Symmetry: D2
C-alpha cells in the first residue's frame, strides 16, 4: 500500500463572516502565503505526494484555480466537492474512489503545525502497518475540540467531542493517519445528535478496538489557532516573526518539494523566473544559488 492525502478545506465559514463571504477561509493569508499552503506542506513533509483537496461547491474551484494539478511541485492534486459541511468523517466517503485500497492521511485545511523534527514526529504514524494515529496537544480550551482522556499510566482511555466537562486539556489536532479501514467505517457511521459525521466517532472505534495510537505533540511545537479573527492575526504575526528572523520561509511548498527531491533545480528556476520581480520569486531563485 501507499498513503494518499486528503486536505479538508470546507466549512460553512460563518464564524468568520463577512471576511469569509469574500474569501474562503483556507485562502486567507497567514503572513506571506495562503493558509492552505501550511497543511499542504505538512503532508509533503510526511512524503505524501498524491493529495485530494475537498472544499465546498463555491470554494473548491478557487483552490483548483490557485494550485492546479500540482505538477509544478512534483505532486498530483485532485479536487472534490463536499456538498454541505456535514462532518469531518465525510471526507472518507467523498474520497472513496481516490483512496482506493490505500492508507490515508487527512489534515484540516486550517491546521498549521510548526516545530523542530516534525517529520520525525510523524514518522511512526506514517510507517504504521494498520490502525490509526492521532496527535494530542495541550490547550487551554479543550472544550472546542475532540478531547482525549489518559489514564494514570499515560494510556488513552476515552475520546469525547466538544465535551462540556472536559476530562483533560489534551486536544486531538487536525492531522490524522489511518489504514484502509476508515472508509467503510465512515460509510457505516451515523450522524451525531448534532447532525454531523464525526471524526471523533471514527477515532473511538479504533480506540475501542485497541488500534488507536495517540502520540503526544509536545509544548515545544506550535499548533496555531485559526478559529477567530484575532487568532488569525496572531498566527500571521507568529509566522512573520519566525520568517523575518531567519530569512527563511515556514511551509513554502516549492522549497519543501525541492529539498525533498520531488523537483529539481531546473524546475525551481523555471518556477522562479516569471516571479523574479516579487520577493517570493527571489526566495525561490536564491534557493537554487546557495
Amino acid at each position: 500500500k501507499m498513503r494518499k492525502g486528503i486536505i479538508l478545506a470546507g466549512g460553512s465559514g460563518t464564524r468568520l463572516y463577512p471576511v469569509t463571504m469574500a474569501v474562503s477561509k483556507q485562502l486567507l493569508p497567514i503572513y506571506d502565503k495562503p493558509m492552505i499552503y501550511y497543511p499542504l506542506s505538512t503532508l509533503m513533509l510526511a512524503g505524501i505526494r498524491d493529495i485530494l483537496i475537498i472544499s465546498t461547491p463555491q470554494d473548491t474551484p478557487r483552490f483548483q484555480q490557485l494550485l492546479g494539478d500540482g505538477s509544478q511541485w512534483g505532486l498530483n492534486l485532485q479536487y472534490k466537492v463536499q456538498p454541505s459541511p456535514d462532518g469531518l468523517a465525510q471526507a472518507f466517503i467523498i474520497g472513496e474512489e481516490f483512496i482506493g485500497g490505500d492508507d490515508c492521511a487527512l489534515v484540516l485545511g486550517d491546521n498549521i503545525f510548526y516545530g523542530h523534527d516534525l517529520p520525525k514526529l510523524m514518522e511512526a504514524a506514517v510507517n504504521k502497518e494498520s490502525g490509526a494515529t492521532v496527535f494530542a496537544y495541550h490547550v487551554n480550551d479543550p472544550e472546542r475540540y475532540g478531547v482525549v482522556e489518559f489514564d494514570k499510566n499515560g494510556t488513552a482511555i476515552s475520546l469525547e467531542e466538544k465535551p462540556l466537562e472536559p476530562k483533560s486539556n489534551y486536544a486531538v489536532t487536525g492531522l490524522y493517519f489511518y489504514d484502509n479501514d476508515v472508509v467503510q467505517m465512515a460509510k457505516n457511521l451515523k450522524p451525531s445528535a448534532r447532525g454531523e459525521l464525526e471524526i471523533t466517532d471514527i477515532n473511538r472505534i479504533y480506540l475501542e478496538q485497541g488500534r488507536l495510537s495517540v502520540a503526544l505533540m509536545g509544548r515545544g511545537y506550535a499548533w496555531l489557532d485559526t478559529g477567530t479573527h484575532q487568532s488569525l492575526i496572531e498566527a500571521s504575526n507568529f509566522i512573520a516573526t519566525i520568517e523575518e528572523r531567519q530569512g527563511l520561509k515556514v511551509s513554502c511548498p516549492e522549497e519543501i518539494a525541492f529539498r525533498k527531491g520531488f523537483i529539481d533545480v531546473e524546475q525551481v528556476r523555471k518556477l522562479a523566473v516569471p516571479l523574479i520581480k516579487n520577493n517570493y520569486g527571489q526566495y525561490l531563485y536564491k534557493q537554487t544559488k546557495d
Copy 2:
C-alpha cells in the same frame, strides 16, 4: 441627488504574490472585514452614497458578487473594469459617464483612514464648491508617494510623484475630492516618466490654478496602506486593538448607513440575519437595541 465617489480597487497585486494569486487584494481581511469595507466606509462617512467601483477584468465581478447594487446599505453601487493599471487618473476617464456633470471623490481601495473628527474633515472638502482637496500626511517613506513641497510659511507650492529626492516627508494620501473639472483634466494627461496617467499631474493643475486645498492631516490621524505582507498584518492588529478596547467597530458599513440614516432599524435587522451567528451580526443586532 446622491453625492458621488469612485473606489479604485484594481492593480496587478503582484507585490503580494501568492496571497493575491487567487484573491483580490482589496477583498483580503483587515482584522474582521474585507479590505474594501474601509474606503467604502470612508466615502459613506463623507456623505457619499452613489459609488462606482473599478477593478481588473478578473476581480471586478468578485466585488459585484459580494456587494451587489448596494441598496441593502442604502447606497447605489455600480462597477467598471480598468483593462490595465495605467494610472490613478484613469479612474476619471473610465468614470466619465458615471460622473456626468457632478463633483466626484476618489479613494484607493487599499487605503485605511482613522481618527477623531475624520467625518468633519471630509465634510469640509465635500462642501468646497470649486477646485479640489487632497490631504498631506507625514510619512517615513515619502518617496513611495506623491510628495508636497512647502514654502517658508507652510504653503504648498509644488507636488512631485515618487521623487528620487523628496522635498518633504508629507505624502498625498489616497483620498481626493474634485469638482467636475477633473474629467477634462484627466482626458488631457499624457503618460508620465513611469508611463502612467498620474493623479499627481491633476493635482498640480489645480495647485497652479490656485484651486488646490492641501489639508494637513495631523499626526493624531492614522492613514495606513496595505503595501506589504507585513503592513497588512500591522493594519489588522491596529484595527483589532481599537475595536477590542472600545467594543465599537471601525468602518462597519452597516453601522455607518444606520447611523447616517441611510437605512432604518428594520433594514439593519435584515442585514444582521446572515451574520447573526457571529460577533459581527450580534454587533449589528445590539445596535438596534442600544
Copy 3:
C-alpha cells in the same frame, strides 16, 4: 512652570507579577520609551510644566534618577512617596503642599492617550474657572472602571466605581482636572468597601454640587489599555505602528518641550547626542535642523 499636574505612578504591582516584582509598572517600556513618558507628555500638551510624580518608597528614587528636576526639558519636576497604595484620591493628600492654593490636574501613570486635537480637547478643562472636568470613553468592559451614567438628554447623572451592573459603557478615563477645592475633599474622604480612597468619590462630590463637566472623548481617540500583560503588548504594538508609519514619535517629551518653546536648539542637541545611537536621538537632532 506655573500650572500644575500630578502623575500618580505607584500601585501594588500585584496584577503583573512577576514583571513588576523588581520594576515599577510605570518604568516598563511602551515600544520605545518608558510608560511614564506618555502621561507626562499629556500634561505638557495641556500646558502644564510644574509636575509632581508620586511613586512607591522603592521606585520614587528610580524616577528621580531618570528624570531629575526636569530642567533639562524646561519643566519643574518634584517627587513624593506614597507609603501604601491606599487610593487614587490620596494623590491630593500627598500632593497637598505641591498644589498650594492652585488648580491641579491628575493623570494616572499608566494612562496612554493618542489622537487628533487632544490639546484642544483638554482646553476647556484647563481653562475652567471652578469645578472639575473628567473625560468619558466607551469601552467594552466598563465594569473595570468608574462608570458614568447618562440621562435621556446628554447629562451625566451618576458615577459608580467598578459596578457589577454597569449603567452605561462609558468609563471615566485616568485624566482629571480640578480646582483647589479637591484637596479638602480628599482629606475628608473615607476609604470605600475596597479599602481605597476613591477618585470616583471626589468626582461624585463635584457632580452632586453641579460643578462636574463630563467631556466625551470620542471613538476617534485611542485610550490604550495597560492593565494586563497582553494589553501592554497591544499598547506597544499600537504606538510602534503609528510611529513607524509616520516617522514621528508619539509622546516624546523632548519634542514637545522643543515645539512648545520650553527649550532651545542647543539644549535639544545636547539631549539628542547621548541617545543618538538609535532612532530616538537621531529623531531629536533632526528636529532642530532644518
Copy 4:
C-alpha cells in the same frame, strides 16, 4: 557537585535608550515574566543548578531582590558585579573563583530559545569532556553577530564577529559551554574595537585547536531577537501566542524546577500560596493538581 553556569545580565544597553536608562534590559518583560527568566530556564533545562549572575553596580541588587539565593527553586544562585561593561569574556575573569576548576556554561541574559527537545539539543554540549560547544542559527542579518562558516562537509572553518562580508548566514547564539580552559583564555584576551573582551575571540581559540563544536539549531527552533524595540515587542507577542494557546508557560523557572525534581509539590504549594492573588500564583498552584 552541581554543574555551573553564568548569566551575564549587565551591559549598558545604549541601543535601547531611553527604555534602558529606566530599567535593566534583562528586567524588561517578555510577555508575562522578566527577560532573565528565559536564559535562567535554559540553564535549568541543561541540568545546571549552581549559577552565578553578573550585572552592573546598579542592577545587581535588583536581580538579587527578584531571585534571592535560589534555594526556593532548588538552585544555588550567587552574584557578582561587573564594574563596567567591558565584554562578554570578562564573565570568566569575574567568575574565576566561582568556576574553580570546573566546566562552566555562559548564557547571555537576553538569549531566549523556544522549541521541541531543547534539553536533548544541549545534551552533548553539557557532557563534553574537553573543548567548547556553541550553537549556530540561520538569520537574515548575520553581520550583527558572530558568524560561523562551514566547508562542504559541514566542518566549521572560521568564526568572525560582525563580519563586513559574512561568510555564511549562520549566527552563533548566546549560549556557550566551556571546559575549564576558558578562564585562562579569557585572562589573555585584549580589548575589541568596541572596547570589550569578546566571546568570539574565546571561541576562535577553541576553533584553532580543533576543539569547537558547532551544534546546528534547526529552523524549527526559535531564537527570539531582543536587539531593538520592535523585536522586543515581537518576542513578547511570540511567547504570548504560545502560552495563550497552550494554557502553559514557556520558561517558568518554578515549573521547570518542579518537573526536574529540584523541588517537590509541597515546596511549589509554599511558593504559590502567597501569589494565588495573581495569575502567576494561580498557575503555580494548578501544577500541583490535575
